[PDB]
Amino acid sequence: GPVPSRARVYTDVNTHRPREYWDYESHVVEWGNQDDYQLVRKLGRGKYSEVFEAINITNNEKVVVKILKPVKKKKIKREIKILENLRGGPNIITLADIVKDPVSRTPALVFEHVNNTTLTDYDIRFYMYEILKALDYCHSMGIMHRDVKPHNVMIDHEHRKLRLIDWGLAEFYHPGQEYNVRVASRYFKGPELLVDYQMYDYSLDMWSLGCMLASMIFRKEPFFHGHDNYDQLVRIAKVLGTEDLYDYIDKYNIELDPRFNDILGRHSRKRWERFVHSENQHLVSPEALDFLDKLLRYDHQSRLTAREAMEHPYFYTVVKD
Numbered sequence: 541g542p543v544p545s546r547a548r549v550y551t552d553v554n555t556h557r558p559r560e561y562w563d564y565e566s567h568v569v570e571w572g573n574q575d576d577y578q579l580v581r582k583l584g585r586g587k588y589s590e591v592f593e594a595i596n597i598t599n600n601e602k603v604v605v606k607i608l609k610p611v612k613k614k615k616i617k618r619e620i621k622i623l624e625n626l627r628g629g630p631n632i633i634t635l636a637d638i639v640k641d642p643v644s645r646t647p648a649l650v651f652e653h654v655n656n657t658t659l660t661d662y663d664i665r666f667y668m669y670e671i672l673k674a675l676d677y678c679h680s681m682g683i684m685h686r687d688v689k690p691h692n693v694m695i696d697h698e699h700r701k702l703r704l705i706d707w708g709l710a711e712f713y714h715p716g717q718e719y720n721v722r723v724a725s726r727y728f729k730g731p732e733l734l735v736d737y738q739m740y741d742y743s744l745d746m747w748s749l750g751c752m753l754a755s756m757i758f759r760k761e762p763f764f765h766g767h768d769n770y771d772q773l774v775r776i777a778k779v780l781g782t783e784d785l786y787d788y789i790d791k792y793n794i795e796l797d798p799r800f801n802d803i804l805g806r807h808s809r810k811r812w813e814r815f816v817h818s819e820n821q822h823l824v825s826p827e828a829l830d831f832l833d834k835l836l837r838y839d840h841q842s843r844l845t846a847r848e849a850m851e852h853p854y855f856y857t858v859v860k861d
């Protein structure tokens with residue numbers, strides 16, 4: 541069957557931690573009282589959560605309350621544990637409290653308040669660097685986000701702040717573990733997910749990040765538009781080319797679902813110049829394209845790490861200032 545894989549970095553960080561750190565099923569959640577919060581207004585609905593601005597009436601602080609839709613208790617424990625483990629890290633959303641409604645018994649996460657919110661080449665580089673700080677941090681702490689995408693990035697330009705949010709899909713990396721491929725939004729799914737390669741790692745997040753970068757510098761949202769998980773990889777293959785795809789499939793001895801043999805065909809690797817146009821050219825640089833090229837690889841092992849990405853020339857100006 542498939543050839544195994546291990547993270548190039550942060551491989552064993554969880555093995556070296558106490559079990560309690562990663563064994564979130566055993567975490568006991570103490571719920572506070574929702575009636576210490578009064579909801580003010582709805583901020584937006586998500587797949588498994590609806591978010592409100594609220595007030596803590598004990599001390600009149602503005603906070604954000606994320607009411608969880610029905611999801612298995614294991615997954616609520618997982619998100620809480622991850623948020624607690626990451627709390628205080630660079631650009632990580634800060635979990636303030638965990639509450640349950642006294643009637644409905646529906647659980648809610650309470651966060652620190654941030655505003656949600658014409659982008660300059662510099663701005664994109666800056667905010668991408670800020671995302672990379674959060675990803676390097678969470679990866680270094682043994683956690684994959686698994687859902688990096690614009691909806692999960694809060695940006696307050698006034699204060700030039702960035703928070704990575706919605707850790708509901710995040711999971712701990714353990715070398716050798718086979719994960720669920722049925723995660724992430726379609727447009728941001730890595731090739732590993734699409735070919736059903738389960739022994740994936742932090743590198744998934746780097747693909748998703750590359751997808752984001754492509755969408756912004758090229759003004760094409762989504763960049764890889766798909767009509768079905770199958771067609772999603774077809775769209776990727778039409779850009780990255782089929783030679784490298786089949787090389788990856790061979791290397792890991794991956795078996796490609798029937799619904800893929802007569803749909804991928806044969807495609808050249810397309811040069812990034814083909815996406816550049818007069819109304820995005822101000823966002824596109826040799827540096828940007830070199831960086832993007834080094835994120836968007838089929839082979840998860842060959843993608844830049846977060847820390848490597850931060851050292852790329854695209855970010856030299858940001859690092860300076």
Ligand SMILES: O=S(=O)(NCCCCNCc1ccc(-c2ccccc2)c(Cl)c1)c1cccc2cnccc12
Binds near residue numbers: 604695
């Ligand atoms: O409504 S909400 O549920 N979510 C909405 C957030 C929308 C963020 N997307 C905008 C965005 C961010 C970054 C980029 C970017 C920048 C530079 C380079 C590349 C991409 C762009 Cl172009 C766009 C929510 C709201 C408030 C607090 C919450 C607190 N906790 C949970 C949810 C929360």
